[PDB]
Nucleic acid binder design. Sequence first.
DNA 1: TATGGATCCATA
DNA 2: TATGGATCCAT
Lengths: 207, 210
Amino acid sequence: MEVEKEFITDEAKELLSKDKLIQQAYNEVKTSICSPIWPATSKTFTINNTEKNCNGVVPIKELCYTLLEDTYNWYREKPLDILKLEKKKGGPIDVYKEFIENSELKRVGMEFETGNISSAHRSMNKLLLGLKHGEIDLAIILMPIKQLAYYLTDRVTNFEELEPYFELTEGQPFIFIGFNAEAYNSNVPLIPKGSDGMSKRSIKKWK
Amino acid sequence: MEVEKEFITDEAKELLSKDKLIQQAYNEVKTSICSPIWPATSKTFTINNTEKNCNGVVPIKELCYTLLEDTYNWYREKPLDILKLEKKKGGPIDVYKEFIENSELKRVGMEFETGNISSAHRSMNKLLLGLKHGEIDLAIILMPIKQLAYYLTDRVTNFEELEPYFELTEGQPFIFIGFNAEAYNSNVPLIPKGSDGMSKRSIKKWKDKV
DNA sequence: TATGGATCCATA
DNA sequence: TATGGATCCAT
Ligand SMILES: [Ca+2]
Ligand SMILES: [Ca+2]
């Protein structure tokens, strides 16, 4: 997979240029988001482009989470204290890791988004909450760009649609990364779809 | 319907105490969110409680919207300049009205959220954007409470679930309203899901104003 | 290729 | 029991 678009707040740029741990942290996330391949036999991510919204999205996150977890030792589904300790409501963020050296400690929160675009607003808010309460020093969201999302399940998170809201992160170290497939062709298999929501396969007890 | 839970930021409290137009705005919203009644013929809103998620959410909003639009002159689909003009990306606000008393104008943005809880974060962030850029002076979000939502379409926005995030509206005038039915019974018809529960009512679009 | 939903899923 | 995801829908 490729990182095509990217927004980095002023506070995040300052860390990326002056702090090694954030540079290391940033390096590990980029290499991870680029990891997804398709099909399993390929070295690159190719998206089937037969029709609009033809591919499901479930398998996309796999390799990204494997590298982050297995190789980089990141923590999956990390619950925030503000959420499950104090307020006792809401779930954990996708990934989290503590970058340490000497007395310095940098905590990075992150969310990978292939859920509905509205789900990305929650993700941004959770990370904003975690940043406000001093649990993470940097927040990062990963999501497909519109060109790629056009071939994925209708209404999934796309960089361009969440973009008008990036400013709601002012004064806080945040980074938004939009990813894209390396090739677009009808020579590959369709990424399978679930029976979720309004899929013709979902059980609807109303008709 | 009943308004059972509510969070009012301190900035909104102040406006509600010192400003009569904001006081009027609130009362129109309050009366509108209490207007829904199940059995169109019924006095109050009784919700069928036979199963988990047994009712659709669309008809629940009809009376509230209709009172705000037709009786109180609120408009639907007010595009924000920051979104329509500057960023040229993003949809409009759900309900909008400009209050006037002489030289004073009070713009109130409001979203009636019966979408997925994740959609509520979009609603709040959009009102926050309108607020931050001085396009509105007060934001309002209507949503059922957890107990009511248990019998509504799975994962619908609910007061308690958005609650952890109310603090993100800090330093800005915002109102969160949680409503609930007056009764739960199995002898009232199910609120239909899908197209059956869609009203083909023409709404008062802001674009069609003067 | 726009946009806020409405609904049902999968895991706990 | 609760919570983050995923899939189409109506305009
Ligand atoms: Ca997650
Ligand atoms: Ca995610």
